[PDB]
From Swiss-Prot:
Subunit structure, interactors included: Interacts with mRNA-capping enzyme nsP1. Interacts (via C-terminus) with host G3BP1; this interaction inhibits the formation of host stress granules on viral mRNAs and the nsp3-G3BP1 complexes bind viral RNAs and probably orchestrate the assembly of viral replication complexes. Interacts (via C-terminus) with host G3BP2; this interaction inhibits the formation of host stress granules on viral mRNAs and the nsp3-G3BP2 complexes bind viral RNAs and probably orchestrate the assembly of viral replication complexes. Interacts (via C-terminus) with host NAP1L1.
Name of the protein this chain belongs to: Non-structural protein 3
Whole-protein coverage range: 1334 to 1493 of 2474
Species assigned in the record: Chikungunya virus (strain S27-African prototype) (CHIKV)
Ligand binding (ADP-D-ribose): D13, N27, G35, G115, V116, Y117
Effect of Y117A: Partial loss of mono-ADP-ribosylhydrolase activity; complete loss of ADP-ribose 1'' phosphate phosphatase activity
């Protein structure tokens, strides 16, 4: 475990993370995809061997000894708000199980279902609150990765609000 488990946020490419493992914002088919998923495919292509997994699940594949946790959030274009919210919560619960199983002291994580799976909505708060619900009982240092300067400010504020 980390000595004083923390949340932090950085605005940069998660493929350049300084943590002991990464969470990919994966598609269910283990395809290279776009956005975070394509950055992850470029950096750790070996981790896409048998990475396909259903919505609401996470599947870990090792790139060398570096764990890539493929977490499949719902595409809100296809899911109802209600069913999508349930699957987005479930994906983060499976990430916390994997992070625990791996014994890592730190994890790099993106906000699931906030990009091309958002169904054109702002889901910062929805996705971040499900991340916290899952990860709060883990003792890994969590580093959240984002690309937008105003998202960076809002995530940092939400972390600081809990102290
Ligand atoms: Cl960058
Ligand atoms: Cl997304
Ligand atoms: Cl972002």
């Amino acid at each position: 475990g980390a000595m004083a488990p923390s949340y932090r946020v950085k605005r940069m490419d998660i493929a350049k993370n300084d943590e002991e493992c990464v969470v990919n914002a994966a598609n269910p088919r283990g395809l290279p995809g776009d956005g975070v998923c394509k950055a992850v495919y470029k950096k750790w292509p070996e981790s896409f061997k048998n990475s396909a997994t259903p919505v609401g699940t996470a599947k870990t594949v090792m790139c060398g000894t570096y764990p890539v946790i493929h977490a499949v959030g719902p595409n809100f274009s296809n899911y109802t708000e209600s069913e999508g919210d349930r699957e987005l919560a479930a994906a983060y619960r499976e990430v916390a199980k994997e992070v625990t199983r791996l014994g890592v002291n730190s994890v790099a994580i993106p906000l699931l279902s906030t990009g091309v799976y958002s169904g054109g909505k702002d889901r910062l708060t929805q996705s971040l609150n499900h991340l916290f619900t899952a990860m709060d009982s883990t003792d890994a240092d969590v580093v959240i990765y984002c690309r937008d300067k105003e998202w960076e400010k809002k995530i940092s504020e939400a972390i600081q609000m809990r102290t």
